[PDB]
Amino acid sequence: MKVINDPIHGHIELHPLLVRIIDTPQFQRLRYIKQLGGGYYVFPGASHNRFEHSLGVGYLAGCLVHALGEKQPELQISERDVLCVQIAGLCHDLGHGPFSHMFDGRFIPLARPEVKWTHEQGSVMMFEHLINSNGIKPVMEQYGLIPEEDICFIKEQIVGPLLWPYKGRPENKSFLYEIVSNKRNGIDVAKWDYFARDCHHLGIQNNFDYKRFIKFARVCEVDNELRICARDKEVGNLYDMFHTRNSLHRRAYQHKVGNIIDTMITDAFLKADDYIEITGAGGKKYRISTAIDDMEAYTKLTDNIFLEILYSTDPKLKDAREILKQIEYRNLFKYVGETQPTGQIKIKREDYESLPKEVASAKPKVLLDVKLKAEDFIVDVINMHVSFYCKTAPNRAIEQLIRVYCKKVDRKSLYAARQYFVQWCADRNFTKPQ
Amino acid sequence: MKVINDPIHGHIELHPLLVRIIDTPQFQRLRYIKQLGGGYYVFPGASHNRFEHSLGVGYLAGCLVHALGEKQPELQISERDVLCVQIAGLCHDLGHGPFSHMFDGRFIPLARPEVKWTHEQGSVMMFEHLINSNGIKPVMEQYGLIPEEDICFIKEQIVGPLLWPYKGRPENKSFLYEIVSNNGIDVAKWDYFARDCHHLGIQNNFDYKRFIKFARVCEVDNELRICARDKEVGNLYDMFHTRNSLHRRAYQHKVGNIIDTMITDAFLKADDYIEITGAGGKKYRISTAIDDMEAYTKLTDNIFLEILYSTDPKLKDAREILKQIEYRNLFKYVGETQPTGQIKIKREDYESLPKEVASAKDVKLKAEDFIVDVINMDIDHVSFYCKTAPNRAIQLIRVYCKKVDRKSLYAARQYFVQWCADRNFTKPQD
RNA sequence: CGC
RNA sequence: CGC
Ligand SMILES: [Zn+2]
Ligand SMILES: [Zn+2]
């Protein structure tokens, strides 16, 4: 089989069935989507894309199931189970759009507030499209997979279930749905890859040692469910991982300028949406916000759309182009403040678009000259339990931030924007900004 | 000052003038050109672009020039001098085209064999274009630079001189011309040695920090040359070895070079049908964008995706080559050879080679089926000093086939071996 | 506001 | 033929 040499995992061995899924346009698309979205414009080392991360997730998913399979043959983990987990690891991010999280986290809710969309649902659709347009089903049979149920298994590891809700594997293998993405504690192999990979590219330092965690993991009975468990001695490695997670969020994922830049890209896309045409199945033409509705079109929707707007000459694209040009010139939106919702609702995606109006409609009655419209405000909604076993008894067990930026960079609008912001938070009973 | 946190160097401090140069479309362009070109298709960690490298080179350039001047005040090293050497470091790669070296190393020769072009020449043109499009001359003045002679000094660091052939700085500051690009020891190699090892997972045994703090300018044959300390000779060996490990394992990688030639082939078949708008509304091709910097500003690795996502029927041939890269149905390796004792093959003759292979001889193959790739790399000449006496010192040629059946593959092998006989080249191994 |  |  083939070896891919990754700076984080060294030599990666890929089963020939994984190679065939990788060597498709639907998987090679991930080479053109930056892992950290606009974070590259803030961190020059963060040039990595979804592709190499996905190889890493596919690789760690395998190492874990194969480690668990050797130390616990009573789990009856087949080599078909291994491949289904690796495929799910490879393919979990297939549905990511331009600038990863900025696309489904901010662009799609602002452009189509009525539509519900996640990158995970995109991954399922893209995976189904990847199989159908490349004849992967026979290659799966050739290598021992049973397509109808194994494809069901792979999709459920990605997006979740549609008593025991799953239908790809029975209850005696429930621990398999915990590897690729863990919806119950947030410890999965995908986190392991990008902690290490993002640290590597940001120059932040990573104390967590994923290999020791794999070496000592075990499946155990916890409330009559089979769950993967860490050794009781290894709590120190887990403390390190959580500290790395907190550093990456505080330093990189929630960086002030990096988030501002994400909203500028989203602004440019929104101004371009009516004029960019992406050709989907049958020659039908889609927009940036509607490419998610046709997988052929989505395949051709990547970070490229930044440069296609930046390089365009079309007069209708001028407004969008000038937003991208201000990023290059480093004339960004200006930070106004921050807040938190007090024991309150999740500010919901359907409401993201109404937010700039509320801020402008707020009444700071300490009245000054300048007044601002909704188009001048950006509102940024940033959305953000381990069982152990002792070695003497091996199968016995033991939120939202809201930033406001202003598109006008004068002293007076920024002074006024602050007054509107401080007023808006009182209206909704948010914490006082300062 | 503004700080940029880089994984190779930690914190980089940028003088306000450098920020002004960096925050232009001409410099930001470098975010959209892979440092290793097609090598990303073999090394998934090699996603790095020319931009981050260029910041490293400016940083390393300042470190060296600043450490010399503080340790040897007799060198008369101004802050004008430091800023100029930083700008030269920041901008030395401004002229790189799509997929870095694959552009001027193979494409421009195959598309316009008449013209003799280098990315360094592009960097001079792109720099001049950068300075005028963003009003950098007044900013240079408000920070103590004399633009007319300093722009010459920056240009000369990047491309070289047109007796003392330089006109940006006098001979008593000859050493300043050795920092950005040189004997082959300069800060540019230092950054990409470290940067490439970091993304490739190869180990870099050279420590540039140790070389920097122990470096001294000394007189050697009437010229002031930058000299390493005697005890750093072991560091120099490690430097020369990681350089050679990077070329043999990464830059001259077999599949990555094959992929580079597939992109080049795609570009030549797309060349007559892509239009890039340059100054005055004039239109240019991938091959002529080099003659107009406004157009060149918009020619990045994005030209790869424009072809790949194109629907024009006239771009189908180029599109299908790129689509063959995604599927991993690549050209096939036939063999390797070298011009032993022979005249090195020159760029102007690159396009003649695929027909010379079909020339020299059941199934027979035409020039269309042959790719000929010419791989170029480009002890002494480095002087050391002792502590007690601190002022005195002491081509590859590969052939690929486009038809991948075993019958055409064995045929192309014989075309190749015979072609080397006619041209006095080595007989390939197995 | 590439602290 | 991302040894
Ligand atoms: Zn992921
Ligand atoms: Zn360079």
Residue A78 belongs to domain with CATH number = 1.10.3210.10
Backbone angles phi, psi at B18, to 5 degrees: -65, -40
Q: State which residues form the domain around B186.
A: 2-253
Contact B155, B126 (CB under 8 A): no
* Strand C nearby residues, CB < 7 A: A 41-44, 255-257, 260, 330, 332, 334-335; B 2-5, 11, 19, 22-23, 28
Total structural domains within chain B: 2
For residues B160 and B152, the answer to whether their CB atoms sit within 8 Å is no
Structure tokens at B289: 């964008």
- B52 shares its domain with B194: yes
- The SS3 of residue A35 is coil
Give the phi and the psi of residue B242 in degrees, each rounded to 5: -65, -30
| Distance of alpha carbon B114 from alpha carbon B134, whole angstroms | 33
| A101 within a domain of the structure (yes/no) | yes
CA A119 to each of CA A267, A296, B54: distance values in angstroms, whole numbers, following the listed order: 20, 16, 34
Closest CA to B332 of B370, B362, B299: B370
User: Resolution reached, in Å?
Assistant: 2.5
Q: Do B28 and A308 touch (CB under 8 A)?
A: no
Beta-carbon separation of B198 and A7 below 8 A: yes
List the CATH number of the domain containing B340.
Answer: 3.30.70.2760
Does B139 reach chain A within 8 Å, measured CB to CB? no
If one counts every other C-beta atom within 10 angstroms of the C-beta of residue A383, the result is 11
Residue A392 DSSP class: S
Interface-testing mutation among B24, B134, B275, B309, with chain A (most A C-beta atoms within 10 A): B309
Q: Which nucleotide is closest to the Cα of A51 by its C1'?
A: D2
- Does B290 reside within a domain? no
Q: What is the DSSP string of A278-343?
A: EE-GGG-EE-TTTGGG-HHHHTT-STHHHHHHHT---GGGHHHHHHHHHHHHT---EEEEEE-BSS
Q: Three-state SS for A255?
A: coil
Query: Per the domain annotation, does B294 fall within a domain?
Result: no
List CB contacts of A130: < 8 A, sequence separation 6 or more. A21, A24, A26, A27, A91, A94, A136
Element at B190 (helix H, strand E):
helix B187-200
Separation of alpha carbons B379 and B359, rounded Å: 42
Classified as helix, coil or strand, B295 is: helix
A263/A41 Cα distance (integer angstroms): 13
A302 close to B (CB below 8 A): yes
Last residue of one domain, picked from the residues A257, A286, A316: A257
Chain A nearest CA to B426, separation (Å)? 31
Query: Do B222 and B363 share a domain, yes or no?
Result: no
Residues 28-47 of A with CB under 7 A from strand D: 28
Distances (CA, A) of B251 to B36, B51, B101, B334: 8, 19, 10, 19
End-of-domain residue from the set B231, B253, B275: B253
Token pair of B329 as six digits = 């149905």
- Do the domain assignments include residue A213? yes
Same domain (yes/no): B17, B141 = yes
* Ligand (nearest to CA of B89): 2
Token look-up 């994923």 returns: A210
Same-domain pairing of A115 and A229:
yes
What percent helix, strand, coil does chain B show, rounded to 5? 55, 10, 35
Q: How far apart are CA A366 and CA A359, in angstroms?
A: 15
Identify whether A73 is part of a domain.
yes
Task: Identify the domain boundary among B253, B278, B294.
Answer: B253
